[PDB]
Structures are given as C-alpha cells and as structure tokens.
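Lab meeting, item 3. Inverse folding demo.
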C-alpha cells in the first residue's frame, strides 16, 4: 500500500498538471480573443478620429470649390 502512496504522489502531480494545463490551453484561446477585442476598440477610436478629420478636411474642398465656381 505504501508503494501505492508513492504512486499517488506521482499520480497527483500528473492529475494536477492535467487540470492546470486544461486551463492553460483555455488561456491561450481566451487570450487571443482578450486582445482582438481590445484591438477593436482602437480600430474604431481611430476610425472615428480619422473620419471626422477626413470629413472636415473634405469640406475645405467645398470652400475651394466656392472660389473655383466664382471664376
């Protein structure tokens, strides 16, 4: 029975490693998503900035067009 106990020391390390690694695999899955979603917030913050920029920059054309139309 002591020899079983010695194995249990082993068996435990192994079972614990299994539980832990089940979680470690799950980490990596979760973590790629717990990143792409963060990336998404910057994607849109900059898009909003660049869009409003682009728009107000675009309307400077309309003022240029007013001058061109005048002549």
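The presenter then showed the designed sequence:
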């Amino acid at each position: 029975e002591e020899d079983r106990d010695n194995a249990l020391i082993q068996q435990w390390r192994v079972e614990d490693t299994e539980m832990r690694l089940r979680r470690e695999t799950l980490k990596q899955k979760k973590l790629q998503d717990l990143y792409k979603y963060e990336e998404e917030n910057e994607k849109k913050l900059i898009e909003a900035k660049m869009l409003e920029t682009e728009i107000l920059k675009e309307q400077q054309m309309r003022d240029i067009e007013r001058e061109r139309k005048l002549r």
